[model samples]
Target chain A: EVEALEKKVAALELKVQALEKKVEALEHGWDGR
Target chain B: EVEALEKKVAALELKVQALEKKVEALEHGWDGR
Candidate 1:
């Protein structure tokens, strides 16, 4: 169960990372506009 | 510029909501397991 939970967390963490990148891009792009 | 940024933010907000739900389910399911 612990292992399963960790795996899910890992996957979700990747999603969060991706979203963070998107946000950074948007912020910079907006600034440049 | 603001409208375009707001659109991106709205999309990201949905992703955030989905991640939140997944985390909540995982936590509850792990407890039950």
Candidate 2:
């Protein structure tokens, strides 16, 4: 159980990184940011 | 440790929801989506 929990968290962390990248890409469109 | 993992996942989920909202707001600016 604990092992899976750790793996799930690692996966979640990867997704968060992806989201952050997308946010950065979106920011590039604002022109004022 | 297991309980903390659940809470951490919940927090990550909340962050993901907030990121989704931001992405939608950004999409509105593009005008093609």
Candidate 3:
């Protein structure tokens, strides 16, 4: 069967990116200190 | 126009993986504890 969720991979990728940014900021200084 | 050596796409993908690792380590500490 054709999977419709495959199309959401791109959006999921964006979500991953957002999560990465959050994690990075949490681990490192995100502020321009 | 269709290009020859599009077969090199696979190699390019590998190169991308290398660069991605470099970028990841550069931005974040890669040394495992």
Candidate 4:
């Protein structure tokens, strides 16, 4: 159970990081444009 | 929701467009000298 829970947490963390990057990209318009 | 909608402007507009082409070229590791 603990191992499965850890995996789930890791997946959630990755999703959060991706969301953060998308937000930054959207806000900054990427390519420094 | 109204306040949130006020945020997130798209395109960044030409008003803020900076003539940083030379700077970008310089920092992009390309010295066209």
Chain A TM per prediction: 0.80, 0.75, 0.64, 0.75
The regions of model 1 sitting more than 4 angstroms off are A1-33, B30-33
Q: TM-score rank, highest first?
A: 2, 1, 4, 3
Taking all chains together, each candidate's TM-score versus the true structure is: 0.46, 0.68, 0.39, 0.44
- Report the lDDT tens digits of candidate 1 across residue range A1-33: 655655655576677878656555544455552
Going through the candidates in order, their DockQ values are 0.03, 0.46, 0.04, 0.02
Tens digit of lDDT per residue, candidate 3, span A1-33?
114333344445565575567557656867831
Error of 3 at B17 (Å): 0.6
- Candidate 4 residue lDDT tens string, A1-33: 655655655565566557556545644568863
Q: What is the TM-score of chain B in candidate 1?
A: 0.80
Q: Mind giving the per-residue lDDT tens digits that candidate 1 earns over B1-33?
A: 456555655665677886666556544764442
- Tell me the spans in candidate 3 whose CA falls farther than 4 Å from its real position: A1-33, B1-6
- The per-prediction tally of clashing pairs is 0, 0, 0, 0
Tens-place lDDT digits, model 4, residues B12-32: 222123223433544564465
Selected candidate, larger DockQ, 1 vs 2: 2
Candidate 1 residue pairs in backbone clash: none
Every candidate's fraction of true contacts kept comes to: 0.00, 0.71, 0.00, 0.00
DockQ of 4: 0.02
Interface RMSD for candidates 1 onward, in order: 14.7, 2.5, 8.3, 13.8
lDDT string for model 2 (B1-30, tens) is 878888888889888898887788786864
Which model scores highest in DockQ? 2
Ranking by DockQ: 2, 3, 1, 4
